[PDB]
Amino acid sequence: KVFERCELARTLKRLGMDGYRGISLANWMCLAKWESGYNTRATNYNAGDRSTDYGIFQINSRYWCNDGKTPGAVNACHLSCSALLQDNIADAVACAKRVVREPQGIRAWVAWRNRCQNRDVRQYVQGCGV
Numbered sequence: 166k167v168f169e170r171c172e173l174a175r176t177l178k179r180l181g182m183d184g185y186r187g188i189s190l191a192n193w194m195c196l197a198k199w200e201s202g203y204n205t206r207a208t209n210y211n212a213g214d215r216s217t218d219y220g221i222f223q224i225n226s227r228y229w230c231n232d233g234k235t236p237g238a239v240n241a242c243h244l245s246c247s248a249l250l251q252d253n254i255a256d257a258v259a260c261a262k263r264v265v266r267e268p269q270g271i272r273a274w275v276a277w278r279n280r281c282q283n284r285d286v287r288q289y290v291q292g293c294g295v
């Protein structure tokens with residue numbers, strides 16, 4: 166499913182993502198935008214290290230979810246990677262909260278670093294009523 170910007174903003178707010186681990190909703194919005202264009206079905210395979218990023222947050226199969234075909238996977242979110250391809254993002258959100266509990270926090274998503282860090286991201290939630 167391809168969320169509409171504000172639809173996503175409110176869905177994320179409902180799920181307690183605003184200010185979670187000190188991360189604003191606008192920052193979460195900027196990262197989902199550049200990681201997947203708000204598409205829950207986005208999948209990106211890395212032929213180099215044989216791992217795949219799944220869902221709206223592009224979470225990695227080596228560390229967070231298990232897809233049965235990734236060498237050295239840890240499955241720290243304790244979910245099937247397929248759970249990150251549902252239209253309902255409750256699972257992807259619970260896993261994204263787990264990802265930020267790492268020392269690097271939100272730096273785990275380089276697309277956040279490239280497109281969100283040190284820029285004005287207030288436009289990602291403007292007009293959404295959140």
Ligand SMILES: *[C@@H]1O[C@H](CO)[C@@H](O[C@@H]2O[C@H](CO)[C@H](O)[C@H](O)[C@H]2O)[C@H](O)[C@H]1NC(C)=O
Nearest residue numbers: 222223224225228229264267268269273274
């Ligand atoms: C993207 O891949 C990163 C590795 O290139 C990964 O970062 C690693 O995550 C580990 C989790 O146990 C640990 O914190 C390493 O120190 C860290 O480098 C990052 O988590 C991945 N991002 C996503 C969204 O899955």
